[PDB]
Design a protein around this nucleic acid. Structure first.
Lengths: 103, 96, 80, 93, 93, 103, 96, 80
DNA sequence: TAATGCTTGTGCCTTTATTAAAGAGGAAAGTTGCGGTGGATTAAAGCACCATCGTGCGGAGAATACGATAAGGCTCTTGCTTCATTTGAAGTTATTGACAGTTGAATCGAGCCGCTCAATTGGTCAATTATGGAGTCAATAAAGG
DNA sequence: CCTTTATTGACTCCATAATTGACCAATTGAGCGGCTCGATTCAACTGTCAATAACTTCAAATGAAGCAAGAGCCTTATCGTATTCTCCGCACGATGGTGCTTTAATCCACCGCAACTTTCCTCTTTAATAAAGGCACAAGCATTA
């Protein structure tokens, strides 16, 4: 048996995503396999982007583990991820910034 | 004696609290206030601890963002002190 | 429970203003902030209690709070 | 009752990008929630697209259009490229 | 291909409320769009509620909860009153 | 044959709303009749409220017809409908207001 | 000869244009501008007339709302003349 | 088509400001407004053209504009 | 205050175009029965939420001296408003012609359902390493000189 | 710039807690086939969108002149800020008690599916009356004195 993920060269599960799409479909719709492959590929891409930025931010501070603070810094430092992710991160804090006229 | 000019310790606190990530309001008063508010919608409610924690985090984030907007509104009018009218203007433009 | 809104002391409001980059604060700011916080809490708690009542429960769950926050466009991460 | 999460695959991706960096439990939960949110948005947009054009079935075309509608700019372009590459590899395998 | 609208029923309601006032075509189209928007919101909220509590059937309880979640205050209370009255009349008839 | 609308004492259609709800359900859902009755009653209530306010606004201006301007006036003059209806009305204009400091 | 002090005819125009409901921008320049903008996304597109009309109504409503917000921002700073900084402040608070 | 943004004349901007209750206007307002309008139109037209391309068509329809506007929370009544 | 130009609200003719009324037909809602899945009911057991005490210490409340900021007033000139003259481009009307949207069949391709196998993923346990506390030293900045 | 004093980053060590690796089970994804519907291709009608001229006239461009509003500077007094002393209630640590949530089995009840009948809701045609354009016009405001 060969998994669909190894067939498409992915790390994320294709069968699980296909099952979730089928569960969430409306009024006896249908879902193809290429849809699941596409969705898994995009999820993997977004995860890799966020994790790469977070790991670089972590290495900037000379630590070996990622915490919510590093995720907050990585997301708020990137414009595309800032637009995409509008949510609140628990324990993330804010980006240090002070206005010029207050100094 | 040794004293500091007004605004120096304020800047130190600004730099200190922008670097940490902990909660800033005490937990027991917030829990009591939440219970009192919820008393008006249903009688004899019970609360899970994580629910109160989530409420506190959301409220603190909301207040910090509103204060950033208020600071912008205060700077626009050539001031450094924030006033209730700045909060009112920010909340009006936000659509609240 | 009565008069618990005053349990949000003015040092806590000062710390919250410090985290937001504020340098000077007036005197009526504390009352204004207390009113604003009360309105926000009322909205969120009303939605959460509705979610709890639909499920035929008597205890408020963190997931009800998460859904109530997401309803008003205030999505929160770390409790779901 | 068993609960389903993406922790194993997030760990695999992290070990791909940074072999010597770990992750805590809170950060992993946050990432799980973020992935769930993105999946929700994509599925919602695909269903709306299928409804507008009177087509019952969801194909990679609907997914591509939903991705173009949801993600911004360079993110959308790169994501489309990766998705097309994955689909081509799957079909040719 | 015929098109389905609510113009007949909007006219009936208007003649119930104001017997001697007419309506133009643009206003009728606007009201049709508004009714469609409200129906969208209600159906969406009911589906989400059914998903959260793991029950596949939509009942008047889900509709009532969705109405309480969507409409504000006095509007919600009066709408709940009308809905309950209609359900009681339907069952007792 | 007795229609469900006359059984429930409504003007809006119950069967049409039930069919639409069944169409919009997701993944083997079910819809009861009381749901359709409730939805039709609420739609009728909202329509009656908006039409009553619009007709009063029309009579204020000594006309015998309703136009988009009257709908805009009625909706923006009521707080509940202002909160509920946030859309833009074509041909409605704005509510006449002028600031005190500009006079 | 007869002359009016500044601000009187401005108030008359404010009262006159707040009572009407017609479109305020000419149609042909707007259609040309929309076609030029759409040229950058796809070559040799065709437009339906109602599409251009809908775009014009949406754009005019957006501009009127933004000008109301800008007027509030200008009044807050003790002025009657609106400036680009007020537009920038309103757009920043709105989240744009 | 080139340099068509200047077809939005200053009198039209003045009328739009009058409808919004504005009494006095500066000189750079017109350029600022032209830029803002261009950004808004770019967003909406991009979404509408995507909707048109999905349906394998070549003509932009008013319903594509309606959907594109609704996506950004700018619902419009009277054209649907 | 006051007249007097001037612009707007009110009354009337027009005429017209836009909403109310009627008709055919076709699309959908009501009726009845049959089966099978989903909602409501009851009992148990365990976990979770509330109430009690102790305590002791770090944060909160009140007074104090005071320096700096918001507010008010005056000058002033440069930029934005009002009005005329001339022109140029939008709006209206009628006309061609081709392109693209829509509809109707035919057909091949693909997704769903169904049972078995076995590999994959979730939960539990011990640990070792990265992280927080505490103390100390040196580098940096601030208040007065 | 210099000197003194308070503050914070950098270094070291110690404890510890929390993330990683290993092992059991229990869950669902892959496989193969049969079948039926849905996306794709092709042809024909035909609706409408883009391009053309001809003409008018009303709104847009430009300039002159004028006036008042934003901006800068100076003064004041009051009000938030930094510091010290006292006290007070919050957070940490155990301990009961109970009530509310979840799970499992059962019963019933009600909703979807399928075919037939009928009646009601939707495009097409005519009109008649309410509303915008034009004319006339009284009256209430704006302006210089």
């Amino acid at each position: 048996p060969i998994t669909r993920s190894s067939r498409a060269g992915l790390q994320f599960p294709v069968g699980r995503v296909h099952r979730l799409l089928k569960t969430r479909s409306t009024a006896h719709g249908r879902v193809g396999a290429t849809a699941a492959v596409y969705t898994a590929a995009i999820l993997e891409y977004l995860t890799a982007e966020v994790l790469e930025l977070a790991g670089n931010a972590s290495k900037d501070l000379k630590v070996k583990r990622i915490s919510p603070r590093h995720l907050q810094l990585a997301i708020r430092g990137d414009e595309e991820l800032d637009t995409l992710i509008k949510g609140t991160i628990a324990g993330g804090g804010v980006i240090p910034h002070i206005h010029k006229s207050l100094i | 004696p040794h004293r500091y000019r007004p605004g120096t310790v304020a800047l130190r606190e600004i730099r200190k609290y922008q670097k940490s990530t902990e909660l800033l309001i005490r937990k027991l008063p917030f829990q009591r206030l939440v219970r009192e508010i919820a008393q008006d919608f249903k009688t004899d409610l019970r609360f899970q601890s994580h629910a109160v924690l989530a409420l506190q985090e959301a409220a603190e984030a909301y207040l910090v963002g509103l204060f950033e907007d208020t600071n912008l509104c205060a700077i626009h009018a050539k001031r450094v002190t924030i006033m209730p009218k700045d909060i009112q203007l920010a909340r009006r433009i936000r659509g609240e | 429970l009565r008069d618990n809104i005053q349990g949000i002391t003015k040092p806590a409001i000062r710390r919250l203003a410090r985290r937001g980059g504020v340098k000077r604060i007036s005197g009526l700011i504390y009352e204004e902030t207390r009113g604003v916080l009360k309105i926000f809490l009322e909205n969120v708690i009303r939605d959460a209690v509705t979610y709890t009542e639909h499920a035929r429960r008597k205890t408020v769950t963190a997931m009800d709070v998460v859904y109530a926050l997401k309803r008003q466009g205030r999505t929160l991460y770390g409790f779901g | 009752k068993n609960v389903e999460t993406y922790k194993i695959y997030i760990f695999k991706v992290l070990k791909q990008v940074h072999p010597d960096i770990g992750i805590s439990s809170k950060a992993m939960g946050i990432m799980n929630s973020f992935i769930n949110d993105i999946f929700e948005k994509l599925a919602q947009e695909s269903s709306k697209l299928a409804r507008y054009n009177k087509k019952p079935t969801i194909t990679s075309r609907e997914i591509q259009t939903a991705v173009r509608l949801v993600l911004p700019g360079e993110l959308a372009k790169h994501a489309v490229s990766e998705g097309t590459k994955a689909v081509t590899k799957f079909t040719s395998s």
